[PDB]
């Protein structure tokens, strides 16, 4: 079972520093060359750094814009690789993924889930969650309910319906940012024979502030 798992991202102050970790398993980590790739709007995918294996002298290579600020290292006894980032700028904001070349000619065969790094002087703020119920009466066959999540920072927030039980007719839209910080909405469409007879609940979690909120959608 092959997996790479990143950790350590989050909100960081401009000019500040941060260390990302990548833990491997399921493959011969000690033979692999490990890389970091980041993604941001505008640049798309961008290679960041690489550290070779011991046989290749643990040599490191960096992309120009991070040379001198970022340091990549690895600990084979722990099957981990680290990315130490210093003097962070707004342009370093993005999703960082750990990926590896397990063997010669294999390409970036394995990727982690990615971790979001946000460089900003703004502070962490929890969200407010408002249920959205229809005005009129159903019927008609399907009814759409919603969940408004606003005022939080930074991203991401996770939204589920009935703790994951409702997944099919769900649309969770990308957050939008403005003076009231982030605003995200999620809708769920269910049979009119499901709501309001049955309980429909919106579950919101904001990792950055450790906030968790469950709001029930009640008929107005």
């Amino acid at each position: 079972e092959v997996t790479l798992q990143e950790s350590g991202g989050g909100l960081v102050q401009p000019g500040g520093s941060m260390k990302l970790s990548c833990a491997a398993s399921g493959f011969t980590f000690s033979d692999a060359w490990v890389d970091w790739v980041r993604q941001s709007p505008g640049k798309g995918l961008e290679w960041v750094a690489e550290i070779r294996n011991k046989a290749n002298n643990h040599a490191t290579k960096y992309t120009e814009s991070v040379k001198g600020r970022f340091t990549i290292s690895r600990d084979d006894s722990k099957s981990s690789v680290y990315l130490q980032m210093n003097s962070l700028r707004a342009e370093d904001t993005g999703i960082y993924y750990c990926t590896s070349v397990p063997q010669l000619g294999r390409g970036f065969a394995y990727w982690g889930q990615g971790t979001l790094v946000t460089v900003s002087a703004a502070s962490t703020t929890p969200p407010s969650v408002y249920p959205l119920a229809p005005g009129s009466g159903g019927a008609g066959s399907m009814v759409t309910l919603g969940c408004l999540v606003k005022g939080y920072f930074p991203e991401p927030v996770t939204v589920t319906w009935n703790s994951g039980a409702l997944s099919s007719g769900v649309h969770t839209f990308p957050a939008v940012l403005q003076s009231d910080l982030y605003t995200l909405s999620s809708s769920v469409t269910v049979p009119s024979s499901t709501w309001p007879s049955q309980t429909v609940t919106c579950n919101v979690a904001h990792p950055a502030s450790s906030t968790q909120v469950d709001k029930k959608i009640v008929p107005k």
């Binding site: 790739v37 982690g112 119920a133 809708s187 469409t189």
Partner: protein, 218 residues
């Protein structure tokens, strides 16, 4: 730096047919050891990239048989023998020959399907939000096709443009539709000076605007 070019930003295709996506490198990707270092990746909405094909034509483990790759030197092609609705996403080529490693800008695969009118739902502010001094009016325009749609907000008949927050989902991997969320941000005070709130949508599936509204005074 080697420049990777993927001319088409996107390619529309109907499920069942074969299609190809091309990529060009500013320099030959043939190495001294005789291998050609070009790889193809797929990135589905919200997920990390995944390797499809390494070194021009080798399918990675777990990748569907319908994918194949060809090319040499500086021109490469990714072909689908039969496209599937679930193939929506962005396809990237990458050169793994010299540092810095570089990626093409990507080509998004768009699945063509029958026209679908949007299901429009409008929502007055929740009482919970009003007691807090806010009044966000939300409008959902769901599961429509094609992707282009225009939304207009009217307050007592007059159009409002400032304070409107718009968000769009990517093409759905199962039904191939698109959805949009539009939020009119008001203060409880502003909200109460008026009575009629309207979410108006313009889409190719209708000659006249799709209109949904309600009145505060109810």
């Amino acid at each position: 730096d080697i420049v990777m070019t993927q001319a088409a930003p996107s390619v529309p295709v109907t499920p069942g047919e074969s299609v190809s996506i091309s990529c060009r490198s500013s320099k030959s990707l043939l190495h001294s050891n005789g291998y050609t270092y070009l790889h193809w990746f797929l990135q589905r909405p919200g997920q990390s990239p995944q390797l499809l094909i390494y070194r021009v034509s080798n399918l990675a483990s777990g990748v569907p048989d319908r994918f194949s790759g060809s090319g040499s030197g500086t021109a490469f092609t990714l072909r689908f023998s039969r496209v599937e609705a679930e193939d929506v996403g962005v396809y990237y080529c990458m050169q793994h020959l010299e540092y810095p490693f570089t990626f093409g800008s990507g080509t998004k695969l768009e699945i063509k399907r029958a026209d679908a009118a949007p299901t429009v739902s409008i929502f007055p502010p929740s009482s919970e939000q009003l007691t807090s001094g806010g009044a966000s009016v939300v409008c959902f325009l769901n599961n429509f096709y094609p992707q282009d749609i225009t939304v207009s907000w009217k307050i007592d008949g007059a159009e409002r443009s400032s304070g409107v927050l718009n968000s769009w989902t990517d093409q759905d991997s199962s039904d191939s539709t698109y959805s949009m969320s539009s939020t009119l941000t008001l203060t409880k005070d502003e909200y109460e000076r008026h009575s009629s709130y309207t979410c108006e949508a313009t889409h190719k599936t209708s000659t006249s605007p799709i209109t949904k509204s309600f009145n505060r005074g109810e």
